[PDB]
Ligand binder design. Structure first.
Ligand SMILES: Cc1cc2nc3c(=O)[nH]c(=O)nc-3n(C[C@H](O)[C@H](O)[C@H](O)COP(=O)(O)O)c2cc1C
Ligand SMILES: Cc1cc2nc3c(=O)[nH]c(=O)nc-3n(C[C@H](O)[C@H](O)[C@H](O)COP(=O)(O)O)c2cc1C
Lengths: 208, 208
């Protein structure tokens, strides 16, 4: 399978070159990510793009000294929607309305249905629900990056609240879930030649 | 991009046909899914495969009557490792040691590194950590299914504790995360013809 070949090409890049990543490439990567399935189709997360070097150097200090946060072409941050329920529901209803040519009443009934269902969860449960959806997105993103021969590294090893504070995400109703520097591996990154370690299928598949 | 085409081909299948999915196809799907990146490469989850029709009709009764759980050719359940820390760490070290040819000393030091790390998490925290990894694997699985032109539907609308009871998962140190019937859509599924709804790139991508 092609996706198996993509799985073998990618790796958790340790050292990036100084090569630039174009906006066209990053847009292709995030456009493919955008089409990922989500719970109820609500897509309760987004992808932030940061290139500014100064800002990213600040994030290194809140990424346990992991320099690749800044020393890469760009940084993508996946952020969950953790603010007003309306910021999750309304943008979906607008798209649903337009795409499915719904009547005003039908749109309002769907808006109500999802608003009530999300309000039924606690803030904590809703946040983790959103976080989970973003992890599905990461799965897409890692393969989309491989198709484009774009290197990356997913990073949970960051100070989440510090990222949120530094980037003022609170006024956007967002919460950092994980970060992914993107770019092109350094010639000098010897970790690209380590053999991949994965569960064999005899352990990963359990027939009941 | 090819992965864009896969995204457009797939959908959350509402009505499955009774057509057989072969083991060779299901194995290609799970083999691609098994190569998914995970936090520390520890892959703290697995996929359970169930075909038994009556067992699944029972799971239907704990899935708010979503008959697709039984109607499909097979059911794949993503299950997080929620038992002994050793059952996450040891299988990793075994594969790591074999693939990268570690000395006994290095393998033990690395085992000890991971056991310490996982034990520092509360049981709840470690469980949700593992759950998050499984959601990355779902992202891969949805695209792998698309590449094989296998239909699927991810499913969180299940009674999770009932699934674990019914399937005896506590004894295996596993917790149901979500379920995914797999097979081939029925021509009678009218939802396959509906326009796919996703929020536009202008909202999904926020450039800081
Ligand atoms: C959710 C997630 C978080 C990760 N966090 C970090 C991180 O903070 N820093 C880092 O260098 N690698 C991080 N990794 C990279 C993993 O260590 C790597 O994916 C795993 O060992 C599998 O190897 P491969 O991706 O190179 O094929 C993370 C990976 C995932 C999936
Ligand atoms: C994590 C997750 C859980 C889902 N749970 C269910 C479910 O329990 N039952 C169902 O019919 N669809 C379920 N869906 C399907 C979504 O409703 C569907 O993915 C979404 O509306 C986007 O449309 P598409 O997948 O057809 O492109 C789930 C999807 C995801 C990603």
């Amino acid at each position: 399978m092609y996706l198996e070949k993509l799985q073998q090409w990618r790796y958790a890049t340790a050292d990036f070159s100084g090569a630039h990543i174009t906006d066209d490439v990053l847009d292709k990567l995030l456009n493919t990510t955008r089409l990922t399935a989500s719970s109820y189709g609500l897509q309760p997360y987004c992808t932030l793009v940061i290139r500014n070097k100064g800002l990213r150097e600040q994030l290194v200090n809140h990424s346990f000294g992991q320099q690749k946060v800044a020393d890469s072409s760009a940084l993508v941050i996946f952020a969950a929607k953790t603010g007003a329920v309306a910021d999750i529901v309304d943008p979906y209803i607008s798209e649903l309305s337009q795409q499915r040519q719904l009547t005003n009443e039908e749109a309002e009934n769907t808006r109500n249905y999802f608003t009530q269902k999300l309000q039924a969860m606690s803030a904590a449960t809703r946040k983790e629900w959103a976080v989970r959806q973003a992890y599905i997105g990461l799965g897409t993103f890692l393969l989309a990056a491989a198709e484009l021969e774009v290197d990356s590294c997913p990073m949970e090893g960051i100070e989440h609240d510090a990222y949120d504070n530094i980037l003022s995400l609170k006024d956007l109703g967002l919460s950092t879930v994980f970060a992914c520097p993107v770019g092109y591996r350094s010639e000098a990154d010897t970790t690209q030649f380590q053999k991949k370690v994965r569960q064999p299928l005899s352990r990963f598949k359990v027939v009941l």
